[PDB]
Amino acid sequence: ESAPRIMRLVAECSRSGARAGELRLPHGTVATPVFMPVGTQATMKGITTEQLDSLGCRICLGNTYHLGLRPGPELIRKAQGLHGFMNWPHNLLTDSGGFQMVSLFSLSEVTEEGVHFRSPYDGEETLLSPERSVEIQNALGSDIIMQLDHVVSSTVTGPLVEEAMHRSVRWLDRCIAAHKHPDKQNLFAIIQGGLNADLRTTCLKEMTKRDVPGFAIGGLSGGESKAQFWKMVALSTSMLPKDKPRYLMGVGYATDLVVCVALGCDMFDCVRTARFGSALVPTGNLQLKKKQYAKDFSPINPECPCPTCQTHSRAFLHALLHSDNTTALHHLTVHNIAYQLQLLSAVRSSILEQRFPDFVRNFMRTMYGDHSLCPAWAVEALASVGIML
Amino acid sequence: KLSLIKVVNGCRLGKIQNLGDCTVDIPGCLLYTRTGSAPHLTHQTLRNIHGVPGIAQLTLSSLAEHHEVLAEYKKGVGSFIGMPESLFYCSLHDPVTPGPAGYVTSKSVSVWGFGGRVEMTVSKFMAIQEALQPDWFQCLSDGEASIKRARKSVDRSLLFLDSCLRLQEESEVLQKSVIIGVIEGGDVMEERLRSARETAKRPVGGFLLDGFQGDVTETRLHLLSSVTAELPEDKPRLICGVSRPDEVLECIERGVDLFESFFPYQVTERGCALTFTFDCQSFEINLKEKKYQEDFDPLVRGCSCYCCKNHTRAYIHHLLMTNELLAGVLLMMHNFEHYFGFFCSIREALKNDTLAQLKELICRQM
Ligand SMILES: Nc1nc2[nH]cc(CN[C@H]3C=C[C@H](O)[C@@H]3O)c2c(=O)[nH]1
Ligand SMILES: [Zn+2]
Ligand SMILES: [Zn+2]
Numbered sequence: 001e002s003a004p005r006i007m008r009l010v011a012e013c014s015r016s017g018a019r020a021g022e023l024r025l026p027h028g029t030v031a032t033p034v035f036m037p038v039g040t041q042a043t044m045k046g047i048t049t050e051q052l053d054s055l056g057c058r059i060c061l062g063n064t065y066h067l068g069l070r071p072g073p074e075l076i077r078k079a080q081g082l083h084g085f086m087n088w089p090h091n092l093l094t095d096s097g098g099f100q101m102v103s104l105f106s107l108s109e110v111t112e113e114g115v116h117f118r119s120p121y122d123g124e125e126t127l128l129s130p131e132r133s134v135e136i137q138n139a140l141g142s143d144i145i146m147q148l149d150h151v152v153s154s155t156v157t158g159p160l161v162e163e164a165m166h167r168s169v170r171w172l173d174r175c176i177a178a179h180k181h182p183d184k185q186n187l188f189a190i191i192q193g194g195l196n197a198d199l200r201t202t203c204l205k206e207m208t209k210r211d212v213p214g215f216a217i218g219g220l221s222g223g224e225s226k227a228q229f230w231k232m233v234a235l236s237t238s239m240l241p242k243d244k245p246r247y248l249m250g251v252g253y254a255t256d257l258v259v260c261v262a263l264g265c266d267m268f269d270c271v272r273t274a275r276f277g278s279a280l281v282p283t284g285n286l287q288l289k290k291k292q293y294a295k296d297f298s299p300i301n302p303e304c305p306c307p308t309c310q311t312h313s314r315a316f317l318h319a320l321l322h323s324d325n326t327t328a329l330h331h332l333t334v335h336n337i338a339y340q341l342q343l344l345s346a347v348r349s350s351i352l353e354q355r356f357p358d359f360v361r362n363f364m365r366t367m368y369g370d371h372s373l374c375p376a377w378a379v380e381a382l383a384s385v386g387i388m389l
Numbered sequence: 390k391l392s393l394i395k396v397v398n399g400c401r402l403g404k405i406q407n408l409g410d411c412t413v414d415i416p417g418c419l420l421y422t423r424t425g426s427a428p429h430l431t432h433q434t435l436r437n438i439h440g441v442p443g444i445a446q447l448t449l450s451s452l453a454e455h456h457e458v459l460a461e462y463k464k465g466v467g468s469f470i471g472m473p474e475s476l477f478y479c480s481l482h483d484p485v486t487p488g489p490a491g492y493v494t495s496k497s498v499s500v501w502g503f504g505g506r507v508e509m510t511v512s513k514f515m516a517i518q519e520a521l522q523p524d525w526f527q528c529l530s531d532g533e534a535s536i537k538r539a540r541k542s543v544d545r546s547l548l549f550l551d552s553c554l555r556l557q558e559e560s561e562v563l564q565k566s567v568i569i570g571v572i573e574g575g576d577v578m579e580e581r582l583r584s585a586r587e588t589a590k591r592p593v594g595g596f597l598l599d600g601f602q603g604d605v606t607e608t609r610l611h612l613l614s615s616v617t618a619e620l621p622e623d624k625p626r627l628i629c630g631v632s633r634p635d636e637v638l639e640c641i642e643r644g645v646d647l648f649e650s651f652f653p654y655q656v657t658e659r660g661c662a663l664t665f666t667f668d669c670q671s672f673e674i675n676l677k678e679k680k681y682q683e684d685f686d687p688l689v690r691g692c693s694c695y696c697c698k699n700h701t702r703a704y705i706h707h708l709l710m711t712n713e714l715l716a717g718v719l720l721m722m723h724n725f726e727h728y729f730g731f732f733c734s735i736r737e738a739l740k741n742d743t744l745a746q747l748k749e750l751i752c753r754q755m
Contacts, residue, residue: 046714071707087699295461311432311471319455323503324424
């Protein structure tokens with residue numbers, strides 16, 4: 001008598017862990033694997049709902065801490081939730097509000113009651129309990145909500161790692177008890193345990209005993225070695241239920257994305273390169289502020305369908321980066337989001353067509369060259385699931 | 390080819406033809422652009438705005454410093470900035486950010502873009518226009534005359550006009566480009582008539598009424614109507630630095646056809662939305678004000694722009710408070726839509742003989 005599953009698998013790679021699926025969410029079905037941009041990153045750069053929809057985005061992130069400051073949960077309530085406030089008709093995923101985008105200067109030590117925020121100049125502190133985190137995310141009305149976890153940096157060692165991992169299990173249970181309407185929002189657990197294989201193993205074994213609709217993989221992408229990164233991802237996907245989604249937080253580099261799809265991950269987010277003038281392309285990135293682009297009249301990528309590449313040249317973007325930087329940053333952000341969405345759409349098409357191994361080889365060849373020039377960790381991660389370059 | 394339809398109370402209702410051979414309604418406004426784009430808008434978002442003018446205004450001040458790259462590009466500024474389907478009139482100065490005054494001589498005029506002063510003789514001016522290739526361009530002129538200084542403003546501008554005409558006659562590129570004569574003379578009545586009557590002697594495609602910006606005195610309005618009286622009827626009349634709705638109407642009564650649309654951009658940049666009614670029996674609201682934090686109405690009830698049909702005052706207020714550029718996008722869409730709708734109402738009022746009533750409706754809100 002388990003709860004109804006929100007994901008269905010439409011195809012699987014026979015050698016690797018790559019999966020193509022669908023998430024049946026209240027604001028529409030989402031094809032996986034899927035990259036989820038932060039909605040406020042797009043709107044901060046002047047991207048409209050229509051434009052983001054036009055690029056193919058069907059789920060995007062809201063940042064609970066920022067939304068909890070401005071406009072605040074009560075006002076989002078009166079506005080009919082986050083969907084109504086921002087006039088976004090597709091799916092939204094919000095975090096617990098205790099970690100993401102919260103400055104360490106704003107946090108006091110975690111206790112069993114919850115996260116503690118500091119106010120400026122010796123003012124009084126504010127508590128965020130697991131129960132209050134769920135209530136805030138109920139008011140935001142997002143389609144996927146995240147448990148409150150005790151997050152510690154991936155490069156912290158000592159007893160704190162185990163302590164935070166177990167508190168995350170306890171806060172999971174409290175978030176489940178507080179979430180009274182699983183027919184409306186999907187609560188995801190977050191695997192912790194750092195780089196400690198035993199702790200993460202324990203966290204995986206214990207959290208999958210809770211019947212939540214999905215599981216995220218936390219605690220990684222915080223400065224650890226790549227050797228440890230991919231092994232922790234693969235440890236996690238080896239123990240998370242196959243019939244539920246695997247959401248890897250904080251991974252957005254193209255090579256990392258492709259490898260982690262091959263290890264069995266379904267959903268990804270990551271925070272920004274457009275501010276430096278970089279445009280994402282199949283060979284990496286183009287730094288359009290370089291003088292060599294001043295008279296380069298070709299688009300960023302002739303095969304990119306984004307509005308920037310069908311309208312504008314490198315030369316023109318290069319001139320705007322200098323002369324009207326705000327405008328350039330809009331154009332670059334539109335293309336960079338387009339690139340991420342097109343990468344995952346192309347990844348998904350290869351799994352449905354049963355040609356994911358060849359897609360990875362083409363991707364690596366274009367991105368790096370000969371097998372010898374590809375990152376050693378990626379070669380090893382991919383070889384562990386039967387994809388040789 | 391400017392063909393009129395009526396002249397009701399000195400107001401010229403008509404359309405300009407043979408532009409391809411596209412058309413432009415008059416009285417009307419030109420789409421305002423900064424450094425090769427409608428501010429905060431794209432091709433996609435601009436396509437939704439209703440009543441977008443047929444011709445877009447570019448400024449030398451924002452493009453002159455890109456001469457080298459544009460000459461290498463060869464295909465003109467419209468193609469370079471990605472909107473080659475559009476018509477472009479290239480003026481000398483930006484109406485919002487004109488730069489320091491006092492650098493005009495009988496030999497050069499200087500403009501400022503993002504970087505440094507770009508000083509332009511006639512040759513350099515025409516060489517830049519050869520790279521821009523606009524459909525219309527303002528001729529180099531001395532508009533800084535604001536007694537003996539007014540006599541010079543006319544003669545320099547006459548001297549610039551004839552040199553530019555000479556160079557255009559022998560430039561294959563600038564053959565399909567239309568020069569606009571520039572009436573100067575400052576506030577001296579004698580020179581205004583001289584600049585008017587003498588600039589009309591030359592075969593320019595239209596006239597720019599320069600130096601009538603406000604701080605718009607009724608003295609200047611008398612000069613204006615006296616100047617337009619010396620100008621032929623079959624040629625378009627542009628004015629610069631006049632965009633606020635009440636001033637627009639005063640100039641239309643005195644024979645002026647085409648206006649810059651920098652006013653809705655200025656409204657946008659201060660976080661404000663145009664709300665003045667322009668159809669039936671305060672002209673803006675400041676969306677930064679706290680009273681809008683919970684206001685879930687659109688900017689303007691009944692407005693058809695994408696902002697009003699799909700977003701609230703509350704949301705735009707929030708976006709301004711967090712400095713998200715989406716605020717500027719949504720305000721620009723509404724403000725351009727509202728302003729172009731205002732010009733649609735002028736042409737409709739002229740057709741129906743009700744411009745006097747529309748003027749009182751506008752002027753009771755400003
Ligand atoms: N709540 C929550 N949000 C999250 N966003 C991204 C991650 C995962 N990466 C972050 C966590 C630890 C690393 O040092 C890195 O800074 C995460 C999480 O583990 N928990
Ligand atoms: Zn692109
Ligand atoms: Zn509107």
